[PDB]
PDB file of C-alpha atoms and ligand atoms in Angstrom:
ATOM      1  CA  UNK A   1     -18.669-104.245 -43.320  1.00  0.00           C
ATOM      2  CA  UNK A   2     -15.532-106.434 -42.349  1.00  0.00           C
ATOM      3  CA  UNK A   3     -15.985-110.107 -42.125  1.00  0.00           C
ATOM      4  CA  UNK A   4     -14.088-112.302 -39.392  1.00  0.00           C
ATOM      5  CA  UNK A   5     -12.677-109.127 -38.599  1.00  0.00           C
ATOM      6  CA  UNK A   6     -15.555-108.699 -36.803  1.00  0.00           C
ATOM      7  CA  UNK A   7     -14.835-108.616 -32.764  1.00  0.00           C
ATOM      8  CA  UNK A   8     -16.577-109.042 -29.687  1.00  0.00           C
ATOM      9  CA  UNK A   9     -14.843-106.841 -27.015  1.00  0.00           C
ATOM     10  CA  UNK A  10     -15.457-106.774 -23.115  1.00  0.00           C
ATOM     11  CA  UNK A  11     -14.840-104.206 -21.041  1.00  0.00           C
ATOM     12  CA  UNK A  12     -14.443-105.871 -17.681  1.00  0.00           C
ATOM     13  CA  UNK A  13     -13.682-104.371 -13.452  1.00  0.00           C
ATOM     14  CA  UNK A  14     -14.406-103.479 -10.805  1.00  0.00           C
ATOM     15  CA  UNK A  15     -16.764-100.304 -10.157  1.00  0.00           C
ATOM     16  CA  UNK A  16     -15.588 -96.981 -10.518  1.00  0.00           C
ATOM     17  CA  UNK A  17     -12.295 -98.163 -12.358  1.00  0.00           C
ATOM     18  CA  UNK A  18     -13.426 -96.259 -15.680  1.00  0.00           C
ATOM     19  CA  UNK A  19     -14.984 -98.417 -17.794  1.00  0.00           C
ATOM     20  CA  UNK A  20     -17.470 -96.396 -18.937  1.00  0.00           C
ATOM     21  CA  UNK A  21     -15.433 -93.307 -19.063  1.00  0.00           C
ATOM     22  CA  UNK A  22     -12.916 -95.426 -21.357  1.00  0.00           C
ATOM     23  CA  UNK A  23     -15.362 -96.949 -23.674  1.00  0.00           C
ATOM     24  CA  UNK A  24     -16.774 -93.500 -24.267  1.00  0.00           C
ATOM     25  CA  UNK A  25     -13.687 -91.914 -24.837  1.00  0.00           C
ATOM     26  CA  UNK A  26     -13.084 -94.596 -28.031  1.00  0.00           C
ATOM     27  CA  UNK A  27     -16.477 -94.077 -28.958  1.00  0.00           C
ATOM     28  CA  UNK A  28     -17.040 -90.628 -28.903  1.00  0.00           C
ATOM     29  CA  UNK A  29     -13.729 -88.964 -28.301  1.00  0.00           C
ATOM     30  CA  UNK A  30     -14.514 -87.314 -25.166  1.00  0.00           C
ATOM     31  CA  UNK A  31     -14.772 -87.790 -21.540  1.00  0.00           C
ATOM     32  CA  UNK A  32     -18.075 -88.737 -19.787  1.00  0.00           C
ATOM     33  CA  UNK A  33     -17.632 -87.792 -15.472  1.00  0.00           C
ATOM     34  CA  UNK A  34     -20.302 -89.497 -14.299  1.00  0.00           C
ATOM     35  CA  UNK A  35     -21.914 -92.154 -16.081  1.00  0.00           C
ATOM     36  CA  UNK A  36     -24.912 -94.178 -14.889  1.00  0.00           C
ATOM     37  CA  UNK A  37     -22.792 -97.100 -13.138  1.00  0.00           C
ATOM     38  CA  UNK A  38     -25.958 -98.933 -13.785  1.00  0.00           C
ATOM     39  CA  UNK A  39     -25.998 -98.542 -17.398  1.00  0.00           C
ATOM     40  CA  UNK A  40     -24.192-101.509 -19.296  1.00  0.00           C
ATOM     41  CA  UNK A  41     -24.701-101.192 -22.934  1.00  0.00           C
ATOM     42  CA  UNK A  42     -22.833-102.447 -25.685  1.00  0.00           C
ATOM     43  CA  UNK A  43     -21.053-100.179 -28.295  1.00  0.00           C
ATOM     44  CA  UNK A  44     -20.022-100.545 -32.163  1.00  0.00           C
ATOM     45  CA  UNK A  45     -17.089 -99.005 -33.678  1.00  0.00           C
ATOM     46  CA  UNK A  46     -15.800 -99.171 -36.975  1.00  0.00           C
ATOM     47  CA  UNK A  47     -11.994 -98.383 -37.359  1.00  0.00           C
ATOM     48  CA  UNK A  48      -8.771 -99.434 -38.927  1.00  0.00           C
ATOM     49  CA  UNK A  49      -5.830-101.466 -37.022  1.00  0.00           C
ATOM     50  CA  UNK A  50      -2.406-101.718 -38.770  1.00  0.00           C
ATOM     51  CA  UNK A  51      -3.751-101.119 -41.977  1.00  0.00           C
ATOM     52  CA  UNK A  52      -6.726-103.442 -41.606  1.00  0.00           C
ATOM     53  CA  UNK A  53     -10.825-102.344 -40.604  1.00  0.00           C
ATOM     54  CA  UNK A  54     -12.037-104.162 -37.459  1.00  0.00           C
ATOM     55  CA  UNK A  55     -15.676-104.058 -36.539  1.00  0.00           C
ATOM     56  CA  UNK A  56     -15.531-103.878 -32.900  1.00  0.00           C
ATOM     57  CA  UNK A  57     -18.658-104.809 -30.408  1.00  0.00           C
ATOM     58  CA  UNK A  58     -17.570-103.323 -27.042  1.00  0.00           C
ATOM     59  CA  UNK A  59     -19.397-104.625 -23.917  1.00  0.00           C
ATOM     60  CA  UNK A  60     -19.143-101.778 -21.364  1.00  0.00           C
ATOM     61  CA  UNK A  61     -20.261-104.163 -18.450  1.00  0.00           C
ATOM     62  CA  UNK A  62     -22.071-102.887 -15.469  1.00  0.00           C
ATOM     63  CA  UNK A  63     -21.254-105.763 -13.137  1.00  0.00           C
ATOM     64  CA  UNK A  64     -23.540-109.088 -12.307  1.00  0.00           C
ATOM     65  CA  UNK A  65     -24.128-107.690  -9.153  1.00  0.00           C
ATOM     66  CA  UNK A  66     -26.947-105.151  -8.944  1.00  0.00           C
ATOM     67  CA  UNK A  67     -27.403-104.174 -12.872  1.00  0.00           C
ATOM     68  CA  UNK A  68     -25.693-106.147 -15.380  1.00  0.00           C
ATOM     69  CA  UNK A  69     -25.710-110.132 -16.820  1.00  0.00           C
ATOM     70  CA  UNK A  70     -23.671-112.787 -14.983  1.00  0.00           C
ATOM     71  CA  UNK A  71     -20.581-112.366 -16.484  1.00  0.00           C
ATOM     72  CA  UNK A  72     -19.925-116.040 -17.308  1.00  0.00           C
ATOM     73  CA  UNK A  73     -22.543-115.211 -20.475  1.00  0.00           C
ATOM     74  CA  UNK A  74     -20.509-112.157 -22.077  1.00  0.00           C
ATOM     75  CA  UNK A  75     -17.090-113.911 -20.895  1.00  0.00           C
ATOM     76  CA  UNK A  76     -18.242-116.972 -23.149  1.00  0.00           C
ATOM     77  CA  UNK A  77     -19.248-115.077 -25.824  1.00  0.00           C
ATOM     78  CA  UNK A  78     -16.129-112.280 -25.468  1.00  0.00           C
ATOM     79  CA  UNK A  79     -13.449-112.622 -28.034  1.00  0.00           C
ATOM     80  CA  UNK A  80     -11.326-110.466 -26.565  1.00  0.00           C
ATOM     81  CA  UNK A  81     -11.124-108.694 -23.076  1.00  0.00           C
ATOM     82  CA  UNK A  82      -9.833-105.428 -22.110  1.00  0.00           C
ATOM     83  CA  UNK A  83      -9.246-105.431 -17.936  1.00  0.00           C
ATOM     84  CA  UNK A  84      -9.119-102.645 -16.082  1.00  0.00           C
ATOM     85  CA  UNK A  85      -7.999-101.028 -12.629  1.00  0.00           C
ATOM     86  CA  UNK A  86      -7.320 -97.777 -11.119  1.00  0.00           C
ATOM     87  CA  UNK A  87      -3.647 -97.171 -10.296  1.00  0.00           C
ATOM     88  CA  UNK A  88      -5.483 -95.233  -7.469  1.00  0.00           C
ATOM     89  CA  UNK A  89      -7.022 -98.284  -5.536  1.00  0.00           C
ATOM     90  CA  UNK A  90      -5.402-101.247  -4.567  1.00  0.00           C
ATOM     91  CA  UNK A  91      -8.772-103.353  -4.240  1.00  0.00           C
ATOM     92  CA  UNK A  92     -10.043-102.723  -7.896  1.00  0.00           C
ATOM     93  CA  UNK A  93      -5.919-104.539  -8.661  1.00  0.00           C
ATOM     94  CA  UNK A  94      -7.000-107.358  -7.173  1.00  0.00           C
ATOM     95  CA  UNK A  95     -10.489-107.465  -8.687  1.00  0.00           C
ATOM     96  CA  UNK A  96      -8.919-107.984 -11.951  1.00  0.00           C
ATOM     97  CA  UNK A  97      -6.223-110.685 -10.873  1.00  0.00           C
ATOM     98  CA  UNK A  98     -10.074-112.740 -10.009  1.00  0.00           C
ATOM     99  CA  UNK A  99     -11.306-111.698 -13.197  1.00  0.00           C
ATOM    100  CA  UNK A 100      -8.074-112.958 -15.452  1.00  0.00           C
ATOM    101  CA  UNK A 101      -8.485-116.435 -13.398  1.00  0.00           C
ATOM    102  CA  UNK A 102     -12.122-116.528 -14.202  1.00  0.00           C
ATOM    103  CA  UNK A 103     -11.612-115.769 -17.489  1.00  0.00           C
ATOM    104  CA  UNK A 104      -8.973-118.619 -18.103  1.00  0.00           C
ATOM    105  CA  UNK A 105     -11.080-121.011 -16.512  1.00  0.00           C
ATOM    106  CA  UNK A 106     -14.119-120.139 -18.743  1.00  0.00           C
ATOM    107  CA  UNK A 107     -11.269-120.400 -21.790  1.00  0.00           C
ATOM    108  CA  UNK A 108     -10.074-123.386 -20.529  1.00  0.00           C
ATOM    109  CA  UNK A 109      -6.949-121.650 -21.657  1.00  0.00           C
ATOM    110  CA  UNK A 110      -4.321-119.418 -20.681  1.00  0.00           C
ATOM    111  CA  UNK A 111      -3.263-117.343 -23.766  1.00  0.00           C
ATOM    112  CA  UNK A 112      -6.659-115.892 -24.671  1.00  0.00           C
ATOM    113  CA  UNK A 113      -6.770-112.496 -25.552  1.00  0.00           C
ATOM    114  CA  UNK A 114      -6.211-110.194 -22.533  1.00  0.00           C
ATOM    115  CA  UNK A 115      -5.123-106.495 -22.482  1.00  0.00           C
ATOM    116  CA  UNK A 116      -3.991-105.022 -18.712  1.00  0.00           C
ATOM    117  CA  UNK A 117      -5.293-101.534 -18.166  1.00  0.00           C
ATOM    118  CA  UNK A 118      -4.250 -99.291 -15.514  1.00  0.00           C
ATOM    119  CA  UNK A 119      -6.331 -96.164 -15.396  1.00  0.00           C
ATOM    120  CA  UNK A 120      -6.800 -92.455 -13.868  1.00  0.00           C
ATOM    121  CA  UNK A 121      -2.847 -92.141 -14.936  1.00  0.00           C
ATOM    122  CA  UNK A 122      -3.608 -88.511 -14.226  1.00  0.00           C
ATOM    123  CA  UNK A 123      -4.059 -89.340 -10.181  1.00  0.00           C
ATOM    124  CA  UNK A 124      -0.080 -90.180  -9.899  1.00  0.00           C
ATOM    125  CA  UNK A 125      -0.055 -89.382  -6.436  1.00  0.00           C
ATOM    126  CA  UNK A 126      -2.612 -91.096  -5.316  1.00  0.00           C
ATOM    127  CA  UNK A 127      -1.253 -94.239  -6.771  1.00  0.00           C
ATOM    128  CA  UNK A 128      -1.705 -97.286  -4.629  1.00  0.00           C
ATOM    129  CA  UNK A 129      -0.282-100.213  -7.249  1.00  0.00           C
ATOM    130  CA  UNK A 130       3.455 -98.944  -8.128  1.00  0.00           C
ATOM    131  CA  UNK A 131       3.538 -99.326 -12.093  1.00  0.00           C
ATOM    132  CA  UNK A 132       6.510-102.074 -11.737  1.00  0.00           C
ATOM    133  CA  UNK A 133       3.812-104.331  -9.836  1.00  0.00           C
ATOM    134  CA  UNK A 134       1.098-103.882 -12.334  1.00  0.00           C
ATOM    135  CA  UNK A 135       3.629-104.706 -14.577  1.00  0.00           C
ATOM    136  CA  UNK A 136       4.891-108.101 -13.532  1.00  0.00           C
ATOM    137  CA  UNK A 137       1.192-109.103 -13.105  1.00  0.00           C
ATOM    138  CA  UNK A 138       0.897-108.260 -16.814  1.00  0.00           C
ATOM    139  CA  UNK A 139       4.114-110.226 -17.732  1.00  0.00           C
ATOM    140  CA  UNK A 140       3.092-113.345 -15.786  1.00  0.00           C
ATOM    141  CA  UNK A 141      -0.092-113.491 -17.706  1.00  0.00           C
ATOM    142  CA  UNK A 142       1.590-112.593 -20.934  1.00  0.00           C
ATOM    143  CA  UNK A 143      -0.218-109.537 -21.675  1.00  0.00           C
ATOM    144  CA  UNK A 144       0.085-106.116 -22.527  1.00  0.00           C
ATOM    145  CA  UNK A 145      -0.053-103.477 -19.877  1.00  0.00           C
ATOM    146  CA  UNK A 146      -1.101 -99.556 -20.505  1.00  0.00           C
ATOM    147  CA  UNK A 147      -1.210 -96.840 -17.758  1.00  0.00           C
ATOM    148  CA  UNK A 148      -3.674 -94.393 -19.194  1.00  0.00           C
ATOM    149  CA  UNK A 149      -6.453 -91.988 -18.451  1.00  0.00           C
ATOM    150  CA  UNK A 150      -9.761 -91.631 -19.590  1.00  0.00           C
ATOM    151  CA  UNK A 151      -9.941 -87.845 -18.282  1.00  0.00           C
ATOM    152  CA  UNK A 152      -7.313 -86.718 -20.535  1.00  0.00           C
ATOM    153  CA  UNK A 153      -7.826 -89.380 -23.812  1.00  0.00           C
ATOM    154  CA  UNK A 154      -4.523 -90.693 -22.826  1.00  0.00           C
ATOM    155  CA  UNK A 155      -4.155 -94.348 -24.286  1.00  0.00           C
ATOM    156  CA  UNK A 156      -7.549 -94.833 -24.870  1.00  0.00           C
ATOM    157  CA  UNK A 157      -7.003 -95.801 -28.382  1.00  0.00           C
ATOM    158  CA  UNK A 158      -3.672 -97.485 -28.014  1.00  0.00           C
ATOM    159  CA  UNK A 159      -5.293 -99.900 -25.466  1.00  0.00           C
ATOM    160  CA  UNK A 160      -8.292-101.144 -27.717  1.00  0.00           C
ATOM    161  CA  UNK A 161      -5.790-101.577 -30.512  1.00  0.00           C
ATOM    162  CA  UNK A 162      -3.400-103.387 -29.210  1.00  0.00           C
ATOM    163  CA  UNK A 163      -6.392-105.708 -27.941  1.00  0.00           C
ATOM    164  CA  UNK A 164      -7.830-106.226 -31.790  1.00  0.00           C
ATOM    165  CA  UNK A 165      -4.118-107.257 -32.126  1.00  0.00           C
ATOM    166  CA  UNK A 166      -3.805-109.703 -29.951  1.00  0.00           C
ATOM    167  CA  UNK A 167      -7.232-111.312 -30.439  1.00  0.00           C
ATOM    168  CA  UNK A 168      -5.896-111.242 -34.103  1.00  0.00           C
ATOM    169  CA  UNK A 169      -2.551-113.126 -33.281  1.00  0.00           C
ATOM    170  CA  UNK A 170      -4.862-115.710 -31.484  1.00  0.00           C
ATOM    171  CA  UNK A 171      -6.805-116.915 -34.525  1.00  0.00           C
ATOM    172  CA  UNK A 172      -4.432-116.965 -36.631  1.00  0.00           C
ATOM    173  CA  UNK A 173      -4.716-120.405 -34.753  1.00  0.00           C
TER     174      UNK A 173
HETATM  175  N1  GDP B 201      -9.110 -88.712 -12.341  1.00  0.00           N
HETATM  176  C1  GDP B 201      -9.730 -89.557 -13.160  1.00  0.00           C
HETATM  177  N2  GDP B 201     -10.961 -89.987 -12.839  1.00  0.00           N
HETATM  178  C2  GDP B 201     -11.625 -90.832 -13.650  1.00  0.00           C
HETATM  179  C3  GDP B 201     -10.964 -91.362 -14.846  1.00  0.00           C
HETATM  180  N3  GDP B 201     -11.823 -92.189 -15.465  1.00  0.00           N
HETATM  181  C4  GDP B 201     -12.944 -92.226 -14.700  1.00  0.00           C
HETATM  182  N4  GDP B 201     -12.805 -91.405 -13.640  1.00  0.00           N
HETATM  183  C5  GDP B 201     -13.823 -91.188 -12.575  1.00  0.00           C
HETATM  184  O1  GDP B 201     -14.031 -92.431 -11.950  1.00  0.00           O
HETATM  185  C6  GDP B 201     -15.415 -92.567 -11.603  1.00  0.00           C
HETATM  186  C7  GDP B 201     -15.939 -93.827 -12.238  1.00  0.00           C
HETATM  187  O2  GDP B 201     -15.811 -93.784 -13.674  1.00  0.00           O
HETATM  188  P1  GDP B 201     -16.790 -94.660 -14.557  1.00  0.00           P
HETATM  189  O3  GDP B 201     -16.592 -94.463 -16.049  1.00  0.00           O
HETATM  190  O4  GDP B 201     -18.247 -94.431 -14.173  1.00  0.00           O
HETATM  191  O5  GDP B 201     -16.350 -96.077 -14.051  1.00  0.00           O
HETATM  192  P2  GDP B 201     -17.056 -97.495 -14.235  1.00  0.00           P
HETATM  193  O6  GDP B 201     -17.939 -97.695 -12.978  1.00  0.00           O
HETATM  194  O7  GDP B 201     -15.989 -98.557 -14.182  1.00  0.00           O
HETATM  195  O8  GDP B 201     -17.886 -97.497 -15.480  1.00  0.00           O
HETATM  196  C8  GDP B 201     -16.110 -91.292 -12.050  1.00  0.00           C
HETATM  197  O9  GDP B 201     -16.185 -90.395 -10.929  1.00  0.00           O
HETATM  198  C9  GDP B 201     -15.179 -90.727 -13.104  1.00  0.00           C
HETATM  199  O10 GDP B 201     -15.220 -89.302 -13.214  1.00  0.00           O
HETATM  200  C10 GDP B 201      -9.633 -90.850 -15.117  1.00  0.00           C
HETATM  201  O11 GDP B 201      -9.037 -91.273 -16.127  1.00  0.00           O
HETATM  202  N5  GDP B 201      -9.062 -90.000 -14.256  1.00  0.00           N
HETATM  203 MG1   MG B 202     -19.847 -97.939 -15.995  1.00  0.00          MG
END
């Protein structure tokens, strides 16, 4: 039952990224291949983060496009946003350089709480975005960046964390 320690999370990029398949994984600890892409639901998890319970809402988002809300509504209401690409695909990188500008421009900030994740670390490769690039693009946005892989619950948990951390830094505003 926390109290201001209660976050809104969105899970936000392009299709076939992993969203779904990392929102599951922190969920319910194991790894969902082909989820509905036209399912966006939101999630609740309960869970401690450096010593301190967090009630997390996670908005697994489905994309304005076909299925899901316009964005703008969930990006308003988001108090944190975890952003992810495919280290596989080039085009889903530059889907989330438009989503951290629209973002910032709903914020009318630029130091809102922002994790970078690169997924399907597993697909090495295949990788199109060299980890250095991905990186800097992290850095210039002063955010966290984690390569990790919903397939094989690598940094699943260590993303979404280090998100309730920063949207914690940010209001201690
Ligand atoms: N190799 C690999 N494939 C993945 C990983 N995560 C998701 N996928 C695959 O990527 C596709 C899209 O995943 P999904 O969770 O539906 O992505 P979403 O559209 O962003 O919600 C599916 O075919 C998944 O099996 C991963 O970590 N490694
Ligand atoms: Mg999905």
């Amino acid at each position: 039952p926390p109290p201001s320690e209660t976050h809104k999370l969105v899970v936000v990029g392009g299709g076939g990224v992993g969203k779904s398949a990392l929102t599951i994984q922190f969920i319910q600890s194991y790894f969902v291949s082909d989820y509905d892409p036209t399912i966006e639901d939101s999630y609740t998890k309960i869970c401690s983060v450096d010593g301190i319970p967090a009630r997390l809402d996670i908005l697994d988002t489905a994309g304005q496009e076909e299925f899901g809300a316009m964005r703008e509504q969930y990006m308003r209401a988001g108090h944190g946003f975890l952003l992810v690409f495919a280290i596989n695909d080039r085009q889903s990188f530059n889907e989330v350089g438009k989503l951290f500008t629209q973002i910032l421009r709903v914020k009318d900030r630029d130091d809102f709480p922002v994790v970078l994740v690169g997924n399907k670390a597993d697909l090495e490769s295949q990788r199109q975005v060299p980890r250095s690039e991905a990186s800097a693009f992290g850095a210039s946005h002063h955010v966290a960046y984690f390569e990790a892989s919903a397939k094989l619950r690598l940094n699943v948990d260590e993303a979404f964390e280090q998100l309730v951390r920063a949207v914690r830094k940010y209001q201690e505003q």
